[PDB]
């Protein structure tokens, strides 16, 4: 038959620039929720849900962009005004999880408030949008704006490029969309033959997102995909205790450096807190090799190989 899944409609490949701000906060598009499911097991430190939204083909986007969601209610402190937009990286390709160009998906972590001292939850302090999203049911309506963002657009000019993707938590979102486009979908004008390497840091095994899907690519494209995970509460003492994404990158430092020197693109997405550890690690690796990380970084920025979207 063939292994790549047919997608439609192919005219979504014809746009020359990505859509931007098609819908704005004062006049959002009203979309409809198709499904909401929890992505994590019982031991995860909090729920992360996968939400499929039907935009009916009216809010097209490119991989790596974000949708804005305006939760219902009035702005806590903007009397008579609407809630502010919250941005969520789109976790699906432009054809979406049903391969028909009508839906987009979000990967949303519930922001729950607990009294540090008493460990007591206080729902009045919970994050509004994230809980509204993971509480949704099929048929509920959502106000969408966007799409927004250009930083995380996938450079496709070289179908054989190297892409090293580093995520923590929900930062995996854009990468699920890149990888389906590279490996799962039958897109005639984009036939990937390079190397895609995904590093994913989470709390533990039960907190892994889309692991089954990424694991499958290992078995189908052993020569074009690599996947490494770091569980911060279930793995390895390196040069200090427990496992973070930086530790894994350290483990493969020579390869990574080699790839970066050859033109690889490198991407970071997820919680902003992941950045300092990573940068300390890269500096230390460079130093061991007798290189200046500062200079290398300036070069990667100049050549446009460095892509970061953290929040
Ligand atoms: C480009 C971009 C991409 C993003 N992509 C994703 C993504 O893919 N997935 C995702 O899950 N998130 C993503 N985010 C984050 C997302 O936009 C929201 O910031 C996040 O979901 C929390 O919004 P919320 O409305 O739930 O919380 P808000 O209601 O905005 O509250 C923010 C925080 O304040 C805490 N808080 C609220 N009130 C109080 C109080 N009174 N006292 C103490 N603490 C309080 C809340 O519990 C919460 O943690 C992204 C952000 C950006 C900028």
310 C-beta closer than 6 A to ligand 1: no
Q: How far is the CA of 12 from the centre of ligand 1 (A)?
A: 31
Let me know: does 63 contact 69? Beta carbons within 8 Å.
Answer: no
**What resolution does the deposited structure have, in angstroms?**
1.7
89 C-beta closer than 6 A to ligand 1: yes
List 50's β-bridge partners, or say none.
Answer: 37, 107
* Domain 149-310, CATH: 3.40.50.80
Q: Which atom of ligand 1 is nearest to the CA of 173?
A: 8
Q: Which atom of ligand 1 is nearest to the CA of 148?
A: 1
For residue 180, the 8-state DSSP code is I
Query: Determination method here?
Result: X-ray
Annotated active-site residue 309? The verdict is: yes
Q: What are phi and psi of 138, to 5 degrees?
A: -55, 135
List 109's β-bridge partners, or say none.
Answer: 48
Q: How far is the CA of 88 from the centre of ligand 1 (A)?
A: 10
Q: Whose CA is nearest to atom 35 of ligand 1?
A: 127
Q: How far is the CA of 111 from the centre of ligand 1 (A)?
A: 6
The single residue listed with the structure tokens 């929890």 is: 38
Q: In this structure, how many other beta carbons lie within 10 angstroms of the beta carbon of residue 306? A: 16
Per annotation, catalytic residue among 88, 95, 210, 244: 88
List 141's β-bridge partners, or say none.
Answer: 32
Residue extent(s) of CATH 3.40.50.80 domains in the chain: 149-310
Residue 281, Cβ density class (10 Å: 0-12 exposed, 13-18 middle, ≥19 buried)? buried
Q: Please check whether the domain covering 10-148 is classified as CATH 2.40.30.10.
A: yes
Q: In this structure, how many other beta carbons lie within 10 angstroms of the beta carbon of residue 139? A: 8
167 C-beta closer than 6 A to ligand 1: no
The single residue listed with the structure tokens 């892994």 is: 208
87 C-beta closer than 6 A to ligand 1: yes
Annotated active-site residue 269? The verdict is: yes
Strands (E), the chain: 5-6, 29-38, 48-54, 66-70, 86-89, 103-109, 141-148, 162-168, 185-186, 195-202, 225-231, 265-270, 306-310
Buried b (16+ CB within 10 A) or exposed e, 146-175: bbbbeebebeeeeeebbbbbbbbbbbbbbb
311 C-beta closer than 6 A to ligand 1: yes
Let me know: does 236 contact 204? Beta carbons within 8 Å.
Answer: no
Q: How far is the CA of 28 from the centre of ligand 1 (A)?
A: 20
129 C-beta closer than 6 A to ligand 1: yes
Helix axes 293-302, 275-289, angle to 10 degrees: 110
Q: Whose CA is nearest to atom 46 of ligand 1?
A: 127
Q: How far is the CA of 128 from the centre of ligand 1 (A)?
A: 8
């Amino acid at each position: 038959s063939r292994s790549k899944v047919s997608v439609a409609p192919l005219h979504l490949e014809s746009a020359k620039e990505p859509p931007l701000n098609t819908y704005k906060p004062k006049e959002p598009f009203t979309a409809t929720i198709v499904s909401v499911e929890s992505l994590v097991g019982p031991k995860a430190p909090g729920e992360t849900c996968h939400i499929v939204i039907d935009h009916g083909g009216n809010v097209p986007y490119w991989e790596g962009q974000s949708y804005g969601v305006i939760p219902p209610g009035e702005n806590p402190k903007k009397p008579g005004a609407p809630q502010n937009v919250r941005l969520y990286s789109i976790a699906s390709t432009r054809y979406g999880d049903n391969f028909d160009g009508r839906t987009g998906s979000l990967c949303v972590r519930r922001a729950v408030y607990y009294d540090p001292e008493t460990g007591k939850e206080d729902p009045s302090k919970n994050g509004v949008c994230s809980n509204f999203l993971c509480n949704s049911k099929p048929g509920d309506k959502i106000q969408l704006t966007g799409p927004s963002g250009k930083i995380m657009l996938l450079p496709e000019e070289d179908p054989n490029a190297t892409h090293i993707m580093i995520a923590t938590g929900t930062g995996v979102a854009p990468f699920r969309g890149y990888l389906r486009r590279m490996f799962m979908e039958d897109v005639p004008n984009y036939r990937f033959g390079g190397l895609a390497w995904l590093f994913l840091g989470v709390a533990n095994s039960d907190s892994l997102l889309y692991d089954e899907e990424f694991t499958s690519y290992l078995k189908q494209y052993p020569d074009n995909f690599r996947y490494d995970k770091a569980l911060s509460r279930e793995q390895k003492n390196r040069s200090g205790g427990k496992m973070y994404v930086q530790d894994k990158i350290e483990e493969y430092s020579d390869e990574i450096f080699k790839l970066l020197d050859g033109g690889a693109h490198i991407y970071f997405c997820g919680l902003k807190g992941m950045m300092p550890g990573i940068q300390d690690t890269l500096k230390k690796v460079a130093e061991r090799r007798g290189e200046s990380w500062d200079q290398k970084l300036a070069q990667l920025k100049k050549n446009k190989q460095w892509h970061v979207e953290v929040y």
